[PDB]
Amino acid sequence: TKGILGRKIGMTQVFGENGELIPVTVVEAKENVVLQKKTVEVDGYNAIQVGFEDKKAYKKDAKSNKYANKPAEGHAKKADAAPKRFIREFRNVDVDAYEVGQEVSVDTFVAGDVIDVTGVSKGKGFQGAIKRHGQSRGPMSHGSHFHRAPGSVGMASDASRVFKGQKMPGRMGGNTVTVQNLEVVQVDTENKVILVKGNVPGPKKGLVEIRTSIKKGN
């Protein structure tokens, strides 16, 4: 059991040894570090607190997240670590391992292993019904005027209210996502790069998050 962070950078091609073309995701686990170790003794759950991008030291008169407010620095000086931009946890891990304040290098992973992922989805604005939900559009000609709009909401003069679960134009994008049952292809420790079969919810340079699958079959 294990899990790391990373960054979607791009997708490519890569071949199996039977000649089967195999698509692939690229991800970068650069500068992963463990920061804090949240026991069940105090909090009520056993987990691992983590950090990914090196950022810089304390402000002087300074400004946004490129640099670091003191409390972050007060958290990263703690375990002999440089301050980090993205912090995330990982429950369901062998907390007996992972001393506070080390690295979670890609070598924990291995070719052939199965995984899930997590990440934000993509930017998408006020999208209509049929693009948000996939409803079916209406007729063009034969004189109509109902091309794309969401249809008749509800029932009648009775059942006056409109039920909550309906389907309407709102934003389509920002959502936590998970994609069970992907596989790993390769682990290049040189560039500290990993490769994941299939494709992941992310934009370029976005956040991506990984862990060992749960539905192995058990």
Partner: protein, 110 residues
């Protein structure tokens, strides 16, 4: 080539040489590998290269035969280890790079 310099460095290995370099409008005997029935064999396909797109491992071509009155056109990735060998024979002369004007049998590449 660079798309990011992290992709390119790690896809390095799947790349390979022994690629005849050329332009579209080439007759081309592709001596290609096959397995089925557990018979470790090959085939041979011929014809005109319509396309050659893409940089990097994504690179690709598209060939075309007119076997038995029926047009056919196949497109492979370039760097497949499922390919054995290539033989350019002829070499064409054209004022297009993509060749989608190809239809029935007056189509002399010249």
């Amino acid at each position: 080539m660079t798309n990011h310099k992290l992709i390119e460095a790690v896809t390095k290995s799947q790349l390979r040489t022994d690629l005849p370099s050329f332009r579209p409008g080439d007759t081309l005997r592709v001596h290609v590998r096959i397995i089925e029935g557990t018979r470790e064999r090959i085939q041979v396909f011929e014809g005109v290269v319509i396309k050659r797109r893409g940089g990097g491992v994504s690179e690709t071509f598209t060939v075309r035969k007119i076997s038995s009155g029926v047009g056919v056109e196949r497109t492979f990735p370039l760097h497949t280890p499922k390919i054995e060998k290539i033989e350019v024979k002829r070499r064409g002369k054209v004022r297009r790079a993509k060749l989608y004007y190809l239809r029935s049998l007056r189509g002399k590449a010249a």
